[PDB]
Design a protein around this ligand. Structure first.
Ligand SMILES: c1ccc(-c2nsc(N3CCNCC3)n2)cc1
Ligand SMILES: c1ccc(-c2nsc(N3CCNCC3)n2)cc1
Ligand SMILES: [Cl-]
Ligand SMILES: [Cl-]
Lengths: 280, 290
């Protein structure tokens, strides 16, 4: 569940935080609207784990595996079992056109998988629709990702919050003018060159189920009006996700540790961990 | 109001956050449970003002002005009008035994003052009174409650950057100290007991707050703990501050305020880590205190 009030923790012993030592001297760890930007070295996972365990937190994870993409499911699920929200309740939602092609994978206690029988406009619509049909009653937080990926390292409760976006690996060090936002004023996704905090990737976002429903519905509705006007945003649902998060500031921002492609972009020093990466 | 939804912001033009530039290189700006530690340089007040203003945020501010402490009210209130939550709705709650001594002060639009006329010691009384008035009035009247000492003046901005479900403030004597040096209550017989191997920060009892419901929970819990100590003839070394520290140890604050928010320059000077001295102690015989 998601309790209204602060959790009362048991006695815990861990290293004291040091006020006169920054946790990172190389990166920004809080946004100008006071949301944490999640990097290795910013959190004590034992404290967070206990906070979330006490609320009996359930996390849903959606992926779309259509056509040849069903081929990525086995690696995705096996690595999720090793690295995603381990120790917590997880409900995987696999959207697919080939239920019989979904691999048999052994799941840990408190973890389960549902197959949902079935383009970017549609993904937003479908997520929103299934939030209303079932995710709202079944999980507390919903995380939405691409299937052609593998977990290489811990991705846990540190990301959970009402609404989060993830820094796109191509733009985390770029000025706003370089971000590939939709730039036509006719588009619902329009952002001019003097606006923008970050460029978020469409491949990893989430939050409470209700905030995710709201984001995905808003993006779908915006795509529909754009379509009526003969417009398709330059990067489709990702352009709309960016517009949504510009106006509705996320309560956490995930660093590119959470979405990387080592083949394309190597391994810059600011990344102490590569947690979730593209599969060749 | 406080909404159960992300607030939608209008077009605003402000400097882009820079992912590869730390906002501070000299201090910790986020706790290990991912709560911001608020220092000048960490926030853009334009964005925060807009977020809170669009929800018509109302902030209650409590002070206890008993006996001779009523003399501090004019300076406190006049400086709060200049620097506390300017641009937002504010409800001052003055707990006093001398309603007639409360000064006449000019208040801005959307700012109101209420005078609350006041078997246990005083610190217990303060926790009990705040908790009781949360139930009686604050829950219906304001969104956030901020509880401070009256012998204080606002010298610089104190605004919506502090607002969050629960916050405490770093005590100026201890922000650079190891936990073993913290003056927590160390007697295991006390409900405020914290052993040498526990503790994140030493919070000061003179500035805490949060949503009304979280402040009600905190003050009730502290009062109940003090009553248990009382039964056992125990008085925690630093009274309500000791209990505040125990509570915030077990219930992590969702923001922590740096010592910019509670300082005494006569005692501690002005260390380089402080860009602003926002809210400062007022000497007993200050010219504005009468
Ligand atoms: C430049 C452009 C894209 C990327 C990039 N990294 S991961 C990723 N995706 C999208 C496809 N599904 C799996 C997740 N894309 C990196 C650099
Ligand atoms: C050592 C001890 C106390 C302080 C200290 N700064 S402000 C403050 N107060 C308590 C009295 N009411 C006004 C707020 N006290 C600083 C260093
Ligand atoms: Cl606008
Ligand atoms: Cl001690």
């Amino acid at each position: 569940a998601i309790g209204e009030f602060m959790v009362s923790l048991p006695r815990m012993v861990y290293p004291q935080p040091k006020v006169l030592t920054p946790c990172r001297k190389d990166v920004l760890v809080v946004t100008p609207w006071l949301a944490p930007i999640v990097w290795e070295g910013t959190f004590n996972i034992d404290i967070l784990n206990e906070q979330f365990r006490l609320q009996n937190t359930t996390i849903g994870l959606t992926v779309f595996a259509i056509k040849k993409y069903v081929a990525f499911l086995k690696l995705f699920l096996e690595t999720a079992e090793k690295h995603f929200m381990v120790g917590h309740r997880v409900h995987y939602y696999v959207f697919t056109d080939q239920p019989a092609a979904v691999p048999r994978v052994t799941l840990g206690t408190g973890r389960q998988l549902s197959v949902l029988e079935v383009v970017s406009m549609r993904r937003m619509e479908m997520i929103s629709d299934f939030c209303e049909r079932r995710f709202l009653s079944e999980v507390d937080y919903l995380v939405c990702v691409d299937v052609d990926m593998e977990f290489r390292d811990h991705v846990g409760v540190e990301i959970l919050t009402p609404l989060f976006g993830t820094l796109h690996p191509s733009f985390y060090g770029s000025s706003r003018e370089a971000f590939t936002y939709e730039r036509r004023p006719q588009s619902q996704a329009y952002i001019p060159k003097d606006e923008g905090d970050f460029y978020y990737m469409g491949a990893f976002f989430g939050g409470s189920v209700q905030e995710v429903q709201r984001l995905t519905r808003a993006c779908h509705q915006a795509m529909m009006v754009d379509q009526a006007n003969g417009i398709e945003a330059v990067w489709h649902d990702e352009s709309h996700l960016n517009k949504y998060l510009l106006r509705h500031k996320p309560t956490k921002v995930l660093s590119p540790e959470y979405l990387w492609d080592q083949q394309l972009l190597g391994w810059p020093a600011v990344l102490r961990k590569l947690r979730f990466t593209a599969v060749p």
